[PDB]
Design a protein around this nucleic acid. Structure first.
Length: 76
RNA sequence: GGACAGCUGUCCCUUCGGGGACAGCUGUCC
């Protein structure tokens, strides 16, 4: 039971990062690690700016973080 | 219900440099 957006932003972030000139790198500042679920504080860095994303759930963090980098990078 | 590791076999992608994937085996964990 969800909403439905389009697909994964990470792919398009890398596609645009390479097609344009931006180092698409995603990371976490707290929690996360090996046996875990990439979420909580997923931040994304790009060759121009950085984007923090406190995603707290399987539907946020990484997607929400990269999505913001996309919706913002799509403006500049 | 899943994220994250090595392996066995069969297999692919695209906005683009180049790449990877899916089941089984032992696992980290919640």
């Amino acid at each position: 039971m969800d909403e439905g957006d389009k697909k994964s932003p990470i792919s398009q972030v890398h596609e645009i990062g390479i097609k344009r000139n931006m180092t698409v790198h995603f990371k976490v500042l707290r929690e996360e690690g090996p046996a875990h679920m990439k979420n909580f504080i997923t931040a994304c860095i790009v060759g121009s700016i950085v984007t923090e994303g406190e995603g707290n759930g399987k539907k946020v963090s990484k997607k929400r973080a990269a999505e913001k980098m996309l919706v913002e990078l799509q403006k500049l």
